[PDB]
Homo-oligomer: A and B are copies of this chain.
Amino acid sequence: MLYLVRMTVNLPRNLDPREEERLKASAKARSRTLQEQGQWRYLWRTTGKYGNISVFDVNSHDELHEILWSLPFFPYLTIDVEPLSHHPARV
């Protein structure tokens, strides 16, 4: 099942760059796994912005929430989720 997921990062001003580095690394490592296993199908950078537009391929809403909830950046994220369906004119 496909979902279009928009992520926008808003870091607290007082976030120690030490903590940001660790956060970035954890996020990168987490996303790698999810991509390799195919749950995180597409990942694009939103131009000019600290965030991304993604497509997730998972079996249930429950699975999606658990994944998104586990994302290292979750505390600082604004997230938009919407279902995608197969398009008849799709080739």
Contact = CB atoms under 8 A, between A and B. Distances in A.
Contacts of A48: 5, 64-65, 68-69, 79-81, 83
Is chain A's interface secondary structure helix, strand, loop, or mixed overall?
Answer: mixed
Residue among A11, A47, A53, A75 with the most chain B CB within 10 A? A47
Interface residues of A, number: 46
Given A11-B75, A13-B12, A13-B75, A64 B47 contact: yes
A87 B11 contact: no
Contact of A84 (B1, B4, B47): B47
Interface of A: 1-5, 11-14, 27-28, 31-32, 35-36, 42-49, 52-53, 60-62, 64-65, 68-69, 75, 79-91
